[PDB]
Amino acid sequence: MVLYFIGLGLYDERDITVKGLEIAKKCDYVFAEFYTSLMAGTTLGRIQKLIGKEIRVLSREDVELNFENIVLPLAKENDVAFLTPGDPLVATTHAELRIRAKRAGVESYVIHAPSIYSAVGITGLHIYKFGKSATVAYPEGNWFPTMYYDVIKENAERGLHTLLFLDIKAEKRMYMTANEAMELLLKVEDMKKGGVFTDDTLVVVLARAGSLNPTIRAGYVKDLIREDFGDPPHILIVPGKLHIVEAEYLVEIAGAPREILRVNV
Amino acid sequence: MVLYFIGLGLYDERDITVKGLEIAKKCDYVFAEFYTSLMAGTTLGRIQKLIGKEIRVLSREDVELNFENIVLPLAKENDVAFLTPGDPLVATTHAELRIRAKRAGVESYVIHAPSIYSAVGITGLHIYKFGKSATVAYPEGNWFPTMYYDVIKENAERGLHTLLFLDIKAEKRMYMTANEAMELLLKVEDMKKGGVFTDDTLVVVLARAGSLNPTIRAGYVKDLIREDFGDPPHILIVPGKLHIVEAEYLVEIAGAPREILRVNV
Ligand SMILES: Nc1ncnc2c1ncn2[C@@H]1O[C@H](CSCC[C@H](N)C(=O)O)[C@@H](O)[C@H]1O
Numbered sequence: 403m404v405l406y407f408i409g410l411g412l413y414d415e416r417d418i419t420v421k422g423l424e425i426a427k428k429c430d431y432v433f434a435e436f437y438t439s440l441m442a443g444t445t446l447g448r449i450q451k452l453i454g455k456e457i458r459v460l461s462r463e464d465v466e467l468n469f470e471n472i473v474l475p476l477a478k479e480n481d482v483a484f485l486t487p488g489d490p491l492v493a494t495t496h497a498e499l500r501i502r503a504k505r506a507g508v509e510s511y512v513i514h515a516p517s518i519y520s521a522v523g524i525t526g527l528h529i530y531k532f533g534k535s536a537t538v539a540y541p542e543g544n545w546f547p548t549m550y551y552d553v554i555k556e557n558a559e560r561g562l563h564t565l566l567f568l569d570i571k572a573e574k575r576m577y578m579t580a581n582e583a584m585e586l587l588l589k590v591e592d593m594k595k596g597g598v599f600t601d602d603t604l605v606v607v608l609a610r611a612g613s614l615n616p617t618i619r620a621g622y623v624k625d626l627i628r629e630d631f632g633d634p635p636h637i638l639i640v641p642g643k644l645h646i647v648e649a650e651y652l653v654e655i656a657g658a659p660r661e662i663l664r665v666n667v
Numbered sequence: 668m669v670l671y672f673i674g675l676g677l678y679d680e681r682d683i684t685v686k687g688l689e690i691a692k693k694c695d696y697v698f699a700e701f702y703t704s705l706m707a708g709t710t711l712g713r714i715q716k717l718i719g720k721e722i723r724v725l726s727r728e729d730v731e732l733n734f735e736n737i738v739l740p741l742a743k744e745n746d747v748a749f750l751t752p753g754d755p756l757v758a759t760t761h762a763e764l765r766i767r768a769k770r771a772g773v774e775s776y777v778i779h780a781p782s783i784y785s786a787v788g789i790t791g792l793h794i795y796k797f798g799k800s801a802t803v804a805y806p807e808g809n810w811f812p813t814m815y816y817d818v819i820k821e822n823a824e825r826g827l828h829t830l831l832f833l834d835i836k837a838e839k840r841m842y843m844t845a846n847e848a849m850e851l852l853l854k855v856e857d858m859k860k861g862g863v864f865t866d867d868t869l870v871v872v873l874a875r876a877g878s879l880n881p882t883i884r885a886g887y888v889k890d891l892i893r894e895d896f897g898d899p900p901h902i903l904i905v906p907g908k909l910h911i912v913e914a915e916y917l918v919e920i921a922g923a924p925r926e927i928l929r930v931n932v
């Protein structure tokens with residue numbers, strides 16, 4: 403009958419919306435993927451208990467190569483749901499799956515859930531001031547990604563904040579920490595020498611957004627690069643020019659150095 | 668001793684998270700504000716019933732001028748909830764309320780919910796390609812603001828998408844339509860001649876995000892300017908150059924003309 407893309411939220415099984423839970427509980431088949439992000443405060447068991455259904459977990463290969471062969475066929479005679487961490491269509495390629503649904507003659511609906519993209523609002527940074535976003539990918543082999551460095555540069559030049567999604571290798575259970583992202587950025591800085599990311603750069607770290615006590619820290623790279631921000635997932639933000647109110651929140655809530663209050667207008 | 672900032676989500680009373688609802692139910696006092704935005708798909712009465720607690724509504728002045736006299740005193744000896752549409756702190760001024768909480772010796776926690784910032788992912792446009800965001804405001808008397816026009820120009824310039832919030836008179840329950848926003852943008856173009864927004868500009872309109880049946884339309888201004896997109900709230904997006912996958916989604920899901928596949932990619 404129909405296919406539902408339902409977000410599970412930021413941290414635990416309760417970050418799903420009431421709308422999402424009520425709809426998920428009535429579906430005949432429930433699929434899910436847990437490779438696009440990490441929900442550090444729950445387990446498949448708890449999610450299954452809350453929804454009261456067995457969930458078939460799909461790999462990136464199952465989705466990217468066989469979504470129309472695994473999920474869509476059932477969505478023809480049944481109500482099917484496809485669950486994902488955070489919001490289904492944020493920093494994923496899942497939107498394209500709706501195109502496959504259409505071609506397969508399957509109607510699809512989207513149920514949103516809290517997302518890291520908007521959750522960054524808890525850092526006190528004005529969300530409208532964010533510019534282009536990027537992802538810090540783990541170097542592999544002789545391939546060392548560095549494009550995210552240029553994104554930061556372009557944004558900072560315009561006084562905009564840069565949100566940096568951090569890498570994740572779900573199968574290896576590897577989640578990139580803000581510390582690793584900073585290390586990589588310093589290395590890129592040495593090669594490019596654009597003066598974009600140095601030990602004196604002010605950065606912001608948000609770890610485990612969604613939990614009741616996420617880690618929110620702001621400060622210079624030289625002081626934060628070896629700080630313990632707790633378990634993943636983490637996101638790194640490189641702010642552009644700060645408004646006084648943003649600085650005030652970073653100081654009061656994120657433990658930032660009180661000197662950033664002095665904005666060089 | 669605890670204050671909870673809880674997001675209500677995008678459209679109706681079921682858009683709050685399970686975590687947000689359960690926490691609100693265990694709170695001694697539940698406050699709410701509807702001056703930053705409105706919940707178009709529901710009513711105070713319906714939200715009040717779902718939570719099963721009397722909800723005290725606060726005006727902009729109640730919050731901005733007297734938050735520490737109305738809400739904080741109670742949170743000193745009780746568990747208090749402060750409900751807001753969307754995701755807490757996405758509204759710029761609310762972040763500062765956490766500082767007021769701190770100075771009153773009150774702990775505060777944030778319970779996230781979907782925001783239009785992440786919800787726009789449903790347009791098929793890549794979230795990372797969005798640039799600086801802006802709000803389109805109605806001219807008045809001798810005042811004609813046009814800042815939002817320059818934001819579109821700077822983003823598009825760099826191949827980034829521009830998310831445009833449309834004017835809302837929360838208290839008067841009046842919404843600016845995408846049609847009105849397009850008319851205004853054409854006026855600004857006529858005045859600035861930047862070639863930023865014209866009859867040939869491709870735009871995307873998202874109406875009632877959060878609803879199971881939102882309106883997602885994409886096309887050129889000349890064709891959409893007088894189209895009916897349904898009841899508010901309306902969100903207008905001026906895409907930067909598209910990735911073929913974005914274009915395909917707009918055509919297949921948003922009813923965009925095949926033309927965009929060659930003109931806007
Ligand atoms: N709760 C959380 N706290 C901190 N970072 C998070 C996070 N959830 C996701 N991320 C960040 O985003 C990356 C996944 S990108 C997929 C995001 C998802 N669709 C959403 O809407 O949130 C992670 O590697 C991490 O860097």
Ligand code: NA
Nearest residue numbers: 532797798800
């Ligand atoms: Na943005």
